[PDB]
Amino acid sequence: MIINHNVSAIFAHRTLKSNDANLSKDIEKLSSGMRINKAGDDASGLAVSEKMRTQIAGLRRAEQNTEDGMSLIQTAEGYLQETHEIVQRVRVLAVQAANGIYSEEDRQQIQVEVSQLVDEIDRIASQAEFNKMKLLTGAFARLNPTASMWFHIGANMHQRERVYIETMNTAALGLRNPTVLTFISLSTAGKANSVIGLCDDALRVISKQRADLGAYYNRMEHAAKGLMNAYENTQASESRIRDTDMAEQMTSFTRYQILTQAATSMLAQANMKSQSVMRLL
């Protein structure tokens, strides 16, 4: 027999090395819970998985943007609620003032409240705000804007929608001359009669603006629901590609563990083999 080299020992060690490397790879899949931990495992799977991970993180952010957008729209419609009730109060005062049983003093007493209500309309228009941004002054109107309001409701570059909000002060409501800066007066029965029609037009403009904001709000609710649906589907897709099946992977770990033990036992047997011919000397 040959004693200078042991070919059987070389084969057993070589098989042991392969089994040990495979055992390490099974540990990495079980310890982290991911099927792919290095680019060498599955390059296209890693590429698609990381793209879906960018999409998944985007879809939550886009959904959070959509909720924040609905907060802004809801905030704007809250302010217009007070404007609507003030014009309704002015409208009912105009009906009373137009009656002929009143004198000049009574109509001036009505105009006293009218001045306060007009000032409150202007104050609401000036001070309505979301995150230090004025909403009812006209900055986001369609005609001659100073700013544009875009809601980014997608996870990609150009997925954004525009929202317009129009001017909601006394001049924009027809209740004040926008060149002379004089406003409605109920101090005369004839002027009180003309205001009844003016209040109706102002109520129409407020009513149209609330319907616009209601439309924007309903649309963002539909998009928010779809964004939640898209996130669920994308995460299911990313999980199937990237996450390892623990039960299946534990079977692989046990197969390689037993293979390492069998090869180790054989290596020991191979090392004692050469000693047999030592009794011939």
Place this chain on the structure above:
Amino acid sequence: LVPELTEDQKKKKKEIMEQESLWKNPDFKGYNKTFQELHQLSKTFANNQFRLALSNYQSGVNTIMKNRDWVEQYRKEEAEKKRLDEKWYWQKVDRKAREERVVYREKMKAKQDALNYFSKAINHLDEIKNPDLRERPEFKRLLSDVYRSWIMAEYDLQNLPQTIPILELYIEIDDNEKEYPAHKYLASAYSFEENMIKKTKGPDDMLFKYRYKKNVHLLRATELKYGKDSPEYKHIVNVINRDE
């Protein structure tokens, strides 16, 4: 407003155009507005503002004239229409009252529109900041016409106190002080202010100043129309002496 010769000046202007050609940039916007705002003293800006004010003034004058023509036509058409159910006198009185109401409402609407146009013209002429160009005869004529139209429309809308500053500005253009209707309007407006102070029990200094202004301008209007040492002037002196 203004129509827009030395060899040195021509050379300077040529070098300025040559400099502007090198730095040609239609997308340039000056972050500092002062240098750009210097354009408000230029001739081109003055001409543009003058033309805008002229357009607004013609719009207002046209509005007034069309209202007058419409009122004449409405009266004629209402007079020439057959009334087969009208047999009592009180029905005719009621019809005349209805026609008067329609005419009055139309007149007030047209006056309000024309006043809007005149106010826009006033604002347009206000932003001409060149004292030299504000001295041109054409500027004075347009300014006097716009001020006069605004004053008459504002008086017709029963906004008497608002006319006082405009009338005071008016009587300082050229020799507009020599026109007696301006002083008549001023006397009426100051009388309104004095009556307002009286009815509200306001400060006595305000009442005295308004009464003095009204008397001065009434006397000036009387002197300008009927002449000094006239029966009208003597009667007006008697009234002023009794009032003060």
